[PDB]
């Protein structure tokens, strides 16, 4: 307020602690809200007062005062803030004491509460005060506290003081010598935080200072300090090590017990400084000083070694072999027991190794096997150790171990079990142990032929069955998880066994109902219980006491929670379709409808599983199905048949396909929404695979049923209806697929099929749309059934080849091509035949043939292969340059069929042959590169170059086709490029250049038109580079790339938009080689945003530059979003015109 601050300052010298306290409280509430009422006087008083109170005879008040500073600083003119600090930094040396301490705290507070323009001098002034302070001034106390502040500030506000650093360092370094060691520590902390801001000029004075003072003077301190910077810097010390590494070692020999620090060094050194390979020199030493015990003080040594070996192993993966083959398996396991803390670090190290091995001459895993029995022999002695901590390591070991090698422990289950069991008992309030053991056991039983455990069942159950009935739940859940697997171990239903499990059923089943029948224990336990019981039912059930019906009932019941409910569904889907045809008859009755009930909880999971269950049931419990159950589901379906959730859609379509598969009769109800909803799903652009396959299998099993108003002809009209009355390309494709389905189902054909030509020929006014669905139907149907009948069609199909519409023309190409498969000998020859006969249809016919080769049959094709191939090696009549592609795409598809005896053939037209032969072949091989790894890949990886690193420099468009083939490979399978980069790249870049000879002018008055035949090949060159960018990028000489990128910024507009973006890519990706050439990349970028156009230009002419200009900034922009070390070159000429650019680009 106003009079407030006045009244407060009085109450602030109120002699009564309470008032001075409340006055200072009420004063601080104020100094927080809007920094108002600041008299440039009221401040003077206030501050002076606060600083006064900083020395109040009562702690409670003093405290408030210091807590007042914070909000103060940020609420008063810059000189008053100057005052504070100064006044605080001065009391620092006060001859009172409590003043030095509270003044000290005060300082820290201000510091913390800050930032931007403010914090300027606010640390700056300070920095100077601490400096003289930090000077060895024969008062530690002062130093020690200044050093803290120096550290607390240097880091929370390191971004600045840049010009103070050299001045800071110069007062620190000498302290690394302080007779009080605590000062040495405090100082190192400072150095550490110091380098976070550097600058690039200071990381070296510091290091050198350290490398220099490596003059044998006592106190291995400069040691720690090196390690210290390593953790903080790391990167910044990666270009300073050749001298480092050796110096360290040379000293490491020195038999002292603080030698651990050097390891600490090597560790910290080799955990952050990656590209610094002195790996071996290190491993060797560690392993040698890793067993440094004698007979005290040593051990911290062993620790460091252990810790280091741990580091190494956790990043150098490329060293697996070396690891498993030089002391670590052999000499970690060796020292797999010792003191305690150290023992622990040894294990941890190994784990890292196991984890490293974890991938996804003579392999890692194979080297691992070789290790056990050694691993096992070791653990075996450990596993029986009093330490709870140790045994836990044994289990987490075997676990991870077995998780790496799913079969790892086969030859040893017997020396482990005692180990496992042993720990399943007690040394307590360590529930971790019991749980960790319980997990290990679970993992084991999950990846090992069950037979192996049989002899051990007899003595493994009691301890498990007991853990289940343990007080703590966490233990009970695992116990139940093991029990469930333990069951599958003695119930083998997949691979028949001969182990009598009967003598364990009771006990197992017991502990479980005890949990499943509760409702007081954690839900986790309630689910692992239903899960388990479910398995207990699915697998022994059969000799399961008569306590089963009672239990099945239990499930039914449990199924009415929002917890229990989903887990039981699945557990019930598992009890169904289980070898031992288990009876679920009772529970169906009120449960089935309780299931449908779920179908309305819009809960993805539940829908999916509930449906997945209503299916098994119906499938294996048909008779017991009451018509009053089925339609109790049917009703909840329509919303499930939406194009919004295909999976759910197809899941539910499977259910109907089942209902009609084993319960026809109910069909009646399949007409309401249901039917008039699948039919809708058919007309969807989103319908594909999964659901479509089910949509087809459904219809095919609905007609066979024979049903009033749901027959063959009935349904065709339903599908092909909406079309025959006046939307999306996919629609027709799905429709024809069903039509065909419903056709191959009821082969009463000719009516429909013939009734599908006088549908095309029926041109005489026939919606261009019908002709489409018509042709597509003749296609799908023709693929399966033999239309070798009506020959009236061979022509009708071709007539459409001359349609004014692509949509129909293609549809015709497909139809013929596909129909060709229904009867391959009666059609294929015809096709090849017409291909040479009427060439006016070459394109489409060659596509029809593509369909044949593509997806035909594979046995029915081999015959004609030698034929096709002959036709395709002749059709390099370059007639249409679009045609040579279908061919190439055909040669390519063809190759795939027995590539071993076809690729070589192509790897030979190579030499001799013509521009087009050369092209076609290197284009056909392109249409061989698949997205997913294929059989050809191996062989392809080999012959590839003979087309590439050979086709890069021959002649003409052939080179272009080459580039494209290289672009096509490196985009979706560089696994065939890697080796070839070294050879290829040069060329790739060579094609990036301009061939002035490929450019002609076209003058006409003032107007000139430039034709550049090189523009396209060249455009393909840069487009190859952009692709190397996403993948193969390390194998790339980063600068050759940028050399050439520079070349294409100044190229052609169409080529600029690419490189501009390539820059923005390289901005994020690899920045360092950018900045280095950041000045060379800007001249161009500038040129653009400068270039003008004569108003003698047409409107669009301009827009082009407007768009090209702002497309360059976009780059120039991101060229500034690279560590503001880019401001250094030369750069943002604020311009009135240019302004509007980074403006509208932002």
């Amino acid at each position: 307020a106003s009079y407030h601050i006045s009244n407060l300052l009085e109450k602030m010298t109120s002699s009564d602690k309470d008032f001075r306290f409340m006055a200072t409280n009420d004063l601080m509430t104020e100094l927080q809200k809007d920094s108002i009422k600041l008299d440039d006087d009221s401040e003077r008083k206030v501050v002076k007062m606060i600083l006064k109170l900083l020395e109040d005879k009562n702690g409670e008040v003093q405290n408030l005062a210091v807590k007042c500073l914070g909000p103060l600083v940020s609420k008063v003119k810059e000189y008053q803030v100057e005052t504070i600090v100064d006044t605080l930094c001065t009391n620092m040396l006060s001859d009172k004491e409590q003043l030095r301490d509270i003044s000290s705290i005060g300082l820290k507070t201000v510091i913390g509460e800050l930032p931007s323009a403010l914090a300027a001098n606010v640390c700056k002034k300070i920095t100077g005060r601490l400096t003289s302070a930090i000077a060895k001034q024969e008062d530690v106390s002062v130093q020690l506290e200044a050093l803290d502040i120096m550290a607390d500030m240097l880091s929370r506000q390191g971004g600045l003081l840049v010009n103070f650093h050299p001045s800071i360092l110069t007062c620190l370094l000498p302290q690394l010598t302080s007779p009080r060691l605590a000062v040495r520590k405090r100082t190192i902390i400072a150095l550490g935080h110091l380098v976070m801001s550097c600058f690039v000029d200071l990381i070296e004075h510091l290091l050198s200072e350290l490398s220099k003072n490596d003059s044998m003077s006592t106190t291995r301190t400069y040691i720690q300090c090196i390690a210290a910077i390593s953790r903080q810097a790391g990167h910044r010390i990666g270009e300073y090590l050749e001298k480092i590494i050796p110096l360290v070692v040379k000293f490491c020999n020195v038999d002292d017990d603080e030698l651990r620090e050097y390891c600490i060094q090597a560790f910290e050194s080799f955990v952050r400084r990656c590209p610094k390979e002195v790996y071996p020199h290190v491993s060797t030493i560690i392993n040698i000083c890793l067993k440094y015990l004698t007979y005290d003080m040593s051990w911290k040594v062993r620790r460091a070694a252990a810790k280091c070996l741990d580091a190494v192993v956790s990043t150098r993966h490329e060293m697996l072999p070396e690891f498993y083959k030089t002391v670590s398996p052999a000499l970690i396991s060796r020292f797999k027991e010792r003191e305690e803390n150290v023992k622990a670090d040894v294990f941890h190290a190994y784990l890292s190794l196991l984890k490293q091995t974890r991938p996804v001459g003579e392999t890692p895993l194979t080297m691992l096997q070789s290790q056990v029995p050694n691993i096992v022999k070791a653990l075996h002695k450990q596993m029986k150790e009093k330490s709870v901590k140790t045994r836990q390591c044994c289990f987490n070991m075997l676990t991870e171990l077995v998780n790496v090698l799913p079969g790892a422990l086969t030859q040893h289950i017997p020396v482990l079990v005692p180990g496992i069991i042993f720990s399943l008992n007690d040394k307590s309030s360590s529930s971790n142990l019991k749980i960790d053991a319980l997990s290990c056991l679970y993992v084991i039983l999950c990846n090992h032929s069950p037979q192996v455990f049989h002899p051990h069942v007899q003595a493994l159950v009691p301890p498990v069955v007991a853990c289940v009935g343990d007080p703590f739940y966490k233990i009970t859940s695992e116990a139940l998880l093991v029990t469930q697997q333990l069951v599958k171990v003695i119930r083998p239903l997949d691979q028949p066994s001969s182990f009598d499990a009967t003598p364990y059923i009771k006990d197992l089943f017991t502990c479980t109902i005890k949990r499943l029948k509760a409702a007081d224990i954690d839900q986790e336990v309630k689910e692992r219980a239903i899960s388990c019981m479910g398995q207990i039912i699915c697998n022994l059930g059969d000799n399961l006491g008569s306590d089963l019906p009672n239990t099945l009932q239990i499930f039914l019941e449990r199924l009415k929670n929002e917890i229990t409910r989903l887990t039981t569904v699945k557990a019930l889907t598992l009890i169904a379709g289980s070898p031992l045809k288990i009876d679920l008859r009772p529970v169906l009755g009120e449960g089935v409808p309780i299931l449908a009930s779920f179908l309305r909880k819009n809960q993805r999971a539940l829908k999916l599983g509930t449906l997945s269950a209503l299916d098994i049931l119906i499938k294996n419990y048909s008779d017991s199905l009451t018509a009053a159950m089925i339609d109790a589901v049917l009703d909840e379906l329509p919303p499930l048949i939406s194009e919004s959730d295909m999976h759910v859609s197809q899941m539910a379509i499977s259910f109907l396909t089942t209902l009609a598969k084993v319960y026809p009769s109910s069909l009646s109800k399949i007409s309401g929404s249901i039917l008039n909803e699948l039919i809708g799903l058919v007309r969807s652009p989103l319908l594909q695979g999964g659901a479509l396959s089910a949509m087809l299998d459904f219809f095919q099993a609905l007609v066979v049923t024979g049903t009033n108003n749901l027959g063959y002809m009935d349904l065709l009209r339903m599908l092909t209806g909406p079309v025959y009355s006046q939307t999306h390309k996919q629609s027709y494709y799905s429709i024809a697929k069903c039509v065909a389905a419903l056709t191959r189902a009821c082969p009463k054909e000719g009516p429909a099929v013939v009734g599908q030509f006088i549908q095309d020929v029926k041109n005489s006014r026939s919606t261009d749309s019908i002709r489409l669905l018509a042709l597509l139907s003749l296609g799908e149907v023709g693929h399966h059934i033999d239309l070798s009948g009506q020959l009236e069609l061979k022509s009708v199909i071709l007539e459409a080849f001359s349609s004014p519409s692509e949509e129909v023309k293609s549809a015709a190409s497909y139809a013929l091509g596909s129909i060709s498969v229904g009867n391959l000998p009666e059609y294929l020859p015809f096709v090849l035949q017409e291909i040479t006969s009427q060439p006016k249809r070459q394109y489409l016919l060659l596509h029809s043939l593509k369909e044949i080769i593509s997806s035909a049959s594979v046995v029915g094709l081999k015959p004609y292969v030698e034929n096709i191939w002959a036709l395709l090696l002749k059709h390099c009549e370059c007639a249409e340059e679009g045609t040579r592609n279908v061919v190439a795409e055909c040669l390519g598809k063809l190759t795939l069929i027995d590539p071993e005896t076809l690729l070589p053939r192509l790897k030979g037209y190579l030499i001799s042959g013509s521009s087009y032969a050369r092209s076609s072949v290197v284009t056909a091989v392109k249409f061989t590169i698949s997205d997913h790894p294929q059989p050809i890949d191996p062989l392809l990886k080999n012959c590839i170059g003979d087309f590439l690193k050979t086709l890069e420099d021959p002649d003409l468009n052939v080179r272009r086709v080459a580039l494209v083939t290289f672009n096509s490979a490196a985009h979706n399978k560089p696994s065939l490029i890697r080796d070839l980069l070294d050879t290829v790249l040069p060329h790739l870049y060579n094609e990036t250049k301009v061939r002035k000879e490929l450019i002609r002018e076209v003058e006409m008055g003032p107007f000139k038109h430039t034709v550049d035949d090189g523009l396209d090949i060249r455009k393909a060159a840069f487009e190859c580079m952009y692709t190397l960018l996403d993948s193969c990028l390390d194998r790339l000489d980063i600068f050759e790339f940028l050399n050439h990128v520079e070349d294409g910024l100044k190229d052609h507009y169409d080529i600029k938009m690419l490189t501009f973006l390539m820059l923005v890519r390289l901005s994020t990706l690899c920045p360092s080689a950018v900045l280095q050439r950041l000045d060379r990349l800007v001249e161009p970028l500038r040129a653009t945003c400068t270039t003008k156009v004569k108003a003698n230009s047409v409107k669009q002419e301009f827009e082009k530059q407007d768009e090209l200009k702002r497309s360059a900034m976009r780059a120039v922009a991101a060229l500034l979003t690279i560590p503001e070390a880019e401001k250094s070159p030369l750069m943002s000429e604020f311009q009135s015109q240019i302004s509007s650019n980074p403006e509208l680009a932002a």
Binding site: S15, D16, K17, K57, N58, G59
Partner: protein, 88 residues
């Protein structure tokens, strides 16, 4: 033959002003017994709270005899220095 010798002894003692003797100098009763007030008054919420209180100056009083005192003045009634509690 059953003999023990003391070689060292590291003792520790607390110091208090000896101007009185485990006595509260406001009410002159006894820091260990309730202040004279609670002593006379009916058992109550207060009575069950009565104890000693020390000042950073190390003078002790019944929490009530001194708390009462401070109701008017603000200094150690035994050492003119602003009173500050410190322990209960």
């Amino acid at each position: 033959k059953k003999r023990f010798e003391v070689k060292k002894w590291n003792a520790v003692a607390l110091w208090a002003w000896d101007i009185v003797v485990d006595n509260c100098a406001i009410c002159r009763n006894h820091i260990m017994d309730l202040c004279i007030e609670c002593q006379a008054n009916q058992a109550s919420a207060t009575s069950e709270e009565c104890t000693v209180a020390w000042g950073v100056c190390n003078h002790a009083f019944h929490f009530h005899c001194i708390s009462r005192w401070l109701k008017t003045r603000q200094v150690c009634p035994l050492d003119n220095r602003e009173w500050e509690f410190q322990k209960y």
